[model samples]
Target: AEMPWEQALAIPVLAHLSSTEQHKLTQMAARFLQQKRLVALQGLELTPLHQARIAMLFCLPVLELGIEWLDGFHEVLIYPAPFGLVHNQRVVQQQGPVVLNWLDIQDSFDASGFNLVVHEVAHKLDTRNGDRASGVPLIPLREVAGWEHDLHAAMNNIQDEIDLVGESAASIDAYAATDPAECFAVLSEYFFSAPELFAPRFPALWQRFCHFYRQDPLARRRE
Candidate 1:
């Protein structure tokens, strides 16, 4: 039987959260789960608790950005292992609709660095501001200039590091140097996975994200 939204949301594993935290995560996931169907891989051993935790993690960033950040998307296609594909053409029609094939979702609990959920959802956030995933989501009229300045500076810095170090190394992932959107996604992963690294290297960017998202993982880091 499919779980009622409220009952499913009330599961005890997340019962330790404060009322505010619970409210925030539940609201976000409620909207997300309602709007999008999660296609779990057959035979994947994901308990309801595991699904709830992944749902909670998906909501963590959106808690800062709000549920509306995910307004347009539906369907989170999950795979048992890392899904792979090659970009054969810049524009290819899959199932009669043009889609960009640019991401791979893998199942793992290694939260030390990469987080597929955060990365993909960050792409959703990038799309919210506009289709251009250049990291600068559309800001208020008053904040546009500063957004441009900060984003450009960050992108340039990442490229500089890449050029100086050659093909072998990066402070963040080398994939982040690909473009602004990827940079935002990579940073989003770092923000949740290893905030200690993000806080010092890009404090202003981190602060801006804190302001935009309205939560501070650094608080947990401090503790």
Candidate 2:
């Protein structure tokens, strides 16, 4: 498959993966392009390059979990820029379509601990827990309690930091204060984008993420 290998590797997140892993990801990404439809809206045009970038981003999180993890959603809508979305909002998730503003993504790609691709894909994974986003994805029954306990603890600590020093004092974005579901989503962005920065803040949650996702971005970084 001529899967635009260069474009897939162009993403910063895929930088450290060995030649073998990157090769597998390319195949997985190609499968994603074949399985899902990325519709261009608002007069936006998608080239093979654009599709390759988006597919790789979509496959990044699920690279270890398998493409099937992203199965429920079949369509992705790409807009030229963040048209009507709020400032902090980069992407959104719903039943069938995943709306992404190309402009918003570009703005975030350079920011630490923020990536629209990972954030929205995390929501997709969260929804797998029971057709809804509840900050909990399906996991081994035994790990459920630990995940809940750690996530709650981490969320409480982050909220305390906001309540004490102010939003700017918090290490992660203030949007995580939205709810558990959003908290999970936001942390997921960190889990992949800046795992080293977040591990110290939410140790337990990070541990749970490593086990749940079956991959450690931090480990990937060291290797």
| TM-score, every prediction | 0.73, 0.89
Error of 1 at 49 (Å): 2.8
Off by over 4 Å in 1: 1-23, 41-45, 84-110, 166-169
lDDT of 1 by residue, 1-223 (tens): 5434344445433333466777777777766667656666555565555555556656767776677676646555565655311321211111121111112322213446577677766766766745555576546769767866776677788888888986567677767666666778778888777777778888888887787777677675453
Roughly what TM-score does model 1 have, to 2 decimal places?
A: 0.73
For candidate 2, list the clashing residue pairs, or say none: none
Lowest lDDT 10-residue stretch of candidate 1: 90-99
Error of 2 at 1 (Å): 10
Candidate 2 lDDT, 1-223, residue by residue in tens: 4656676476666677778888888899889988999988888887677778788888888988999998768998888886512522422334667778887666444437778888888888887755457678878778778787887777888888899889986788778767777888889988878888788877778888998888888887886
Evaluated at residue 33, the lDDT of candidate 2 is 83
lDDT of every model, 2 decimals: 0.62, 0.78
